[PDB]
Amino acid sequence: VFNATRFASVYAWNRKRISNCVADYSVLYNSASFSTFKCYGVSPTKLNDLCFTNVYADSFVIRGDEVRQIAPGQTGKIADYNYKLPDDFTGCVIAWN
Amino acid sequence: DLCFTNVYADSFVIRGDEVRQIAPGQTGKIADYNYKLPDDFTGCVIAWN
Amino acid sequence: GAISSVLNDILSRLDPPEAEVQIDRLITGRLQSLQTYVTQQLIRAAEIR
Amino acid sequence: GAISSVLNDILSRLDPPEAEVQIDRLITGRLQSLQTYVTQQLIRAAEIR
Structure with missing residues (x-):
């Protein structure tokens, strides 16, 4: 999901199923890997404290200027055509160079 | 126009990409661990190259 | 209008x-x-009075 | 307090x-x-009752 050799295109973004495993996101704060890291429906530091039921990861690559429009309710040539997020979306968005 | 009682300036230098995380309620390495602003903090943030 | 109706969540x-x-x-x-x-209970209480 | 009073707009x-x-x-x-x-209707209705 994070360290895969090659992510799929946003045109056909891989649908990854994460289940029956321990989710530990402290690696992001335990090492400087990703420049951009933000959450909307939850807290970045409480992901490990709070346990979810079914976690799903979406991997895609877009232009740098197109990152700002990757969020719930956003519109543009990426949000409304290939990949869209629900307005009530609950999750986090991760980006790095 | 508004005159304050006591003014304290905190001068520090951080990584270029960490400036956007310096504000009340923001999250990040410096913000969460090293230097944190109060959530109800009243003040201004100034940065330059 | 909130994400969840539970304060703990x-x-x-x-x-x-x-x-x-x-x-x-x-x-x-x-x-x-x-x-x-x-307010409705007070109105009902006035009626009961 | 909204930008407009029409939902469609x-x-x-x-x-x-x-x-x-x-x-x-x-x-x-x-x-x-x-x-x-x-509330006004209920109060007036209590008075009328």
């Missing part, structure tokens, strides 16, 4: 800033409901 | 996220309007 999910906004929305809604309930 | 002009906030404001205001109307 908001506390365990969002940071103090956003958790406070969600809890404020929940408090506003529940307080409006309680004020309406109290 | 907000939907056409504003994006889904900001349109939702404005529609929530309009709904909230109209809800206190309905609450005031109902």
Whole structure:
């Protein structure tokens, strides 16, 4: 999901199923890997404290200027055509160079 | 126009990409661990190259 | 209007800033409901009197 | 307190996220309007009873 050799295109973004495993996101704060890291429906530091039921990861690559429009309710040539997020979306968005 | 009682300036230098995380309620390495602003903090943030 | 109707879920999910906004929305809604309930109960109490 | 008093105008002009906030404001205001109307009607109905 994070360290895969090659992510799929946003045109056909891989649908990854994460289940029956321990989710530990402290690696992001335990090492400087990703420049951009933000959450909307939850807290970045409480992901490990709070346990979810079914976690799903979406991997895609877009232009740098197109990152700002990757969020719930956003519109543009990426949000409304290939990949869209629900307005009530609950999750986090991760980006790095 | 508004005159304050006591003014304290905190001068520090951080990584270029960490400036956007310096504000009340923001999250990040410096913000969460090293230097944190109060959530109800009243003040201004100034940065330059 | 909040993400969830449980205060514990908001506390365990969002940071103090956003958790406070969600809890404020929940408090506003529940307080409006309680004020309406109290007003209607006072009207019923006037009728009972 | 919203940008416009028409839901259709907000939907056409504003994006889904900001349109939702404005529609929530309009709904909230109209809800206190309905609450005031109902309270006045109930009080007048108690007097008429």
